[PDB]
Amino acid sequence: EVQLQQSGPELVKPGASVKMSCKASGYTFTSYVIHWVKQKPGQGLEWIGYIYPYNDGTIYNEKFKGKATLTSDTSSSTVYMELISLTAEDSAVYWCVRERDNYGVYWGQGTTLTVSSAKTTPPSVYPLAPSMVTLGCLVKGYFPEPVTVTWNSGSLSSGVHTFPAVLQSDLYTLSSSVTVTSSTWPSQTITCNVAHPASSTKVDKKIVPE
Amino acid sequence: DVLLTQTPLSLPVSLGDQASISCRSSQSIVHSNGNTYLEWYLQKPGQSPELLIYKVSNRFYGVPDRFSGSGSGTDFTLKISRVEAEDLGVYYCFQDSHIPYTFGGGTRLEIKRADAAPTVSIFPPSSEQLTSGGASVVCFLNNFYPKDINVKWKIDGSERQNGVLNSWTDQDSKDSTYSMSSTLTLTKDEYERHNSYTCEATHKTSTSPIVKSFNRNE
Known part of the structure; x- marks a missing residue:
């Protein structure tokens, strides 16, 4: 099966450069073009350009010329996009996309770039404890986005509401709720797992009756 | 560039009803090989866009048959014959007939219910x-x-x-x-x-x- 694995999210300061990667597997690497797409809130989807790993030829959206450079390494089956002279306008989710064939379309999982002078702050994670009972997890005061919230390491997935973060005093805060049968809590454990990539921190917060 | 303009910006539709989204290109998008490379995608929150329709009217394999595409000249239309709850999200048209490739602005399909x-x-x-x-x-x-x-x-x-x-x-x-x-x-x-x-x-x-x-x- 064809897969494209992108590099993880990055916090980068204005004026720096960054190189994001897209590792391809499951097909002859040099035979298909890879495109990059920018997805910035309030600006929809924008096509950036593509590279053909067969001959390293590139075509760019004029908007990104002198900003984005695509490269290819055949030995590692990896395509890179480098952005220079970074500004807040470059903050976005970036997708790499392989030319489509019959057995599916092939998008990477996305890389979230945040261009900011603010330093990384890990979240403080607090348990929200009191038929179907609702439990929660308050994920307070972190920077940058994103954070990854799950419950019972992802095996508890139905009845979950993880809300969009809101910015408050230059830090993000979100909460997550889970609804489970009383016959399973507290007799069985319920834990929210909060993973913040920029700080490489993961917290497991067990929800315990007050 | 080819501008793609979508109507409406948001489409509330009762569960089980039909829906129709239009996409207008600012110029012709017939590629020099005779084909019209207009695609429709559905993007669910947090996910990558999923291809629904390619070259105006061809349903991609795996896509439910309630989705169909049509159009000619500069007006292209996506139809959903019977909206299901899983169909909500943001629909985009996309053209790769002419460089630079461009996307429409998106239409958010919203389900109406009780x-x-x-x-x-x-x-x-x-x-x-x-x-x-x-x-x-x-x-x-x-x-x-x-x-x-x-x-x-x-x-x-x-x-x-x-x-x-x-x-x-x-x-x-x-x-x-x-x-x-x-x-x-x-x-x-x-x-x-x-x-x-x-x-x-x-x-x-x-x-x-x-x-x-x-x-x-x-």
Whole structure:
């Protein structure tokens, strides 16, 4: 099966450069073009350009010329996009996309770039404890986005509401709720797992009756 | 460049009904090989776009047959014969006939369904947060419909606006409801100066609220 694995999210300061990667597997690497797409809130989807790993030829959206450079390494089956002279306008989710064939379309999982002078702050994670009972997890005061919230390491997935973060005093805060049968809590454990990539921190917060 | 303009910007549609989205190109997008490379994608929240239709009218394999595309000249149309709850999200047209390749602005399909009252849950500050010197009161208002609902807080029975931040999920792909969180942030000092904390949910249609309360002293 064809897969494209992108590099993880990055916090980068204005004026720096960054190189994001897209590792391809499951097909002859040099035979298909890879495109990059920018997805910035309030600006929809924008096509950036593509590279053909067969001959390293590139075509760019004029908007990104002198900003984005695509490269290819055949030995590692990896395509890179480098952005220079970074500004807040470059903050976005970036997708790499392989030319489509019959057995599916092939998008990477996305890389979230945040261009900011603010330093990384890990979240403080607090348990929200009191038929179907609702439990929660308050994920307070972190920077940058994103954070990854799950419950019972992802095996508890139905009845979950993880809300969009809101910015408050230059830090993000979100909460997550889970609804489970009383016959399973507290007799069985319920834990929210909060993973913040920029700080490489993961917290497991067990929800315990007050 | 080829500009792609989508109509409407948002499309509310009853479950089981039909839907139609249009996309107009600012110039011709017949590629020099005779084909018209206009595609339709559906993007669900957090996911990558999924291809639905390619070269105007060809359903991609794996795509449900309730989706179809048509058009000619500069007006292209996506039709959904019977909308299902899983079909909500943002639809985009996309052309790769001419460089630079371009996307439409997106059309958000919103499912219409029956009214649903929120399941409301209130949470006092955790001991952990109080030990750190902070005090957030969290109120979940989950799985309600329609999306417009207001939250008001009361401290000791008096309305409280200072320190309230609200957040809404995208429409749920299983039951077509919305959910919302409302977080009241106070200093621990102010939190310990008062006793009763009330989260109150009102629809814009009705004047009858749903309330959840707790008393710090208990």
